[PDB]
């Protein structure tokens, strides 16, 4: 799945 961590 799409994962967005910055």
């Amino acid at each position, epitope marked *: *799945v*799409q*994962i*967005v*961590y*910055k």
Partner: antibody, heavy 119, light 116 residues
Framework: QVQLQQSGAALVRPGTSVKVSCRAS????????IEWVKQRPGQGLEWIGV????????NYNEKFKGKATLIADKSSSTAYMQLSSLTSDDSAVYFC????????????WGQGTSVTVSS | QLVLTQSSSASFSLGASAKLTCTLS???????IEWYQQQPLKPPKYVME???????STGDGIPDRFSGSSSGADRYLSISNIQPEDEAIYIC?????????????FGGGTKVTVLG
């Protein structure tokens, strides 16, 4: 009004470094991240990287790994992108933009900084 | 492999209905994308976030003429009653975190022309 204000137009010589500034105001600097976007004159947007001001963490497009260095100063609420070894390829409009830690939206964008590498 | 493919830079009559397509790479079918508007010599503007189910959340000062919708890997930006101010390059973006390494990628853009 959420605002990001970048340093002005820069005309520099090949082989040199440049430092564009991105000053945040009217929002919590360390509750969001700063991302940098290149745009050559007739071309589409190109993503360079992101700095997490609160962590100092950086993520970069692989293409700019030897070219762009991203840093942020919390006390000044200001983000900086250093471009090194300037070629005529590096001649573009550089944008800064706000994003969240956890979503993709670049929701607010700086005005931009025209960097010209010319002889 | 994370790839956004934008339909061909196209024209619409003033006050007509426009439907732009941003298509995700097969394996990234489920992904949330963002639409961006770039007007002549302006910085890009955030238009919306758009999810697999076609639900969307629009940016500051985006009129309700702009809606989003989805079908499989396809992400659509619909402009009803298109206006001169809607003349722009519409760019889609998508984020993902692969190896704890975050990457954002943009589509090539669709240049939108408003006729009449």
């Amino acid at each position: 009004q959420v605002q990001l204000q970048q340093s002005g137009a820069a005309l520099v010589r090949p082989g040199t470094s440049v430092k564009v500034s991105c000053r945040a105001s009217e929002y919590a600097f360390t509750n969001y991240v700063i991302e940098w976007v290149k745009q050559r004159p007739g071309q589409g947007l190109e993503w360079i990287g992101v700095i997490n001001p609160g962590s100092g963490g950086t993520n970069y497009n692989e293409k700019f790994k030897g070219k762009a260095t991203l840093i942020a100063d919390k006390s000044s609420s200001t983000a900086y992108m250093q471009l090194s070894s300037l070629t005529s390829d590096d001649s573009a409009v550089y944008f800064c933009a706000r994003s969240t830690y956890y979503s993709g939206a670049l929701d607010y964008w700086g005005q931009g900084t025209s960097v010209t590498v010319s002889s | 492999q994370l790839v956004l493919t934008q339909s061909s830079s196209a024209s619409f009559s003033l006050g007509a209905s426009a439907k732009l397509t941003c298509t995700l790479s097969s394996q990234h079918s489920t992904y949330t994308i963002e639409w961006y508007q770039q007007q002549p010599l302006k910085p890009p503007k955030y238009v919306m976030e758009l999810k697999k189910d076609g639900s969307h959340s629009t940016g500051d000062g985006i009129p309700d003429r702009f809606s989003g919708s989805s079908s499989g890997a396809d992400r659509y930006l619909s402009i009803s009653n298109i206006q001169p101010e809607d003349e722009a390059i519409y760019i889609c973006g998508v984020g993902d975190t692969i190896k704890e390494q975050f990457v954002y990628v943009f589509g090539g853009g669709t240049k939108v022309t408003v006729l009449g």
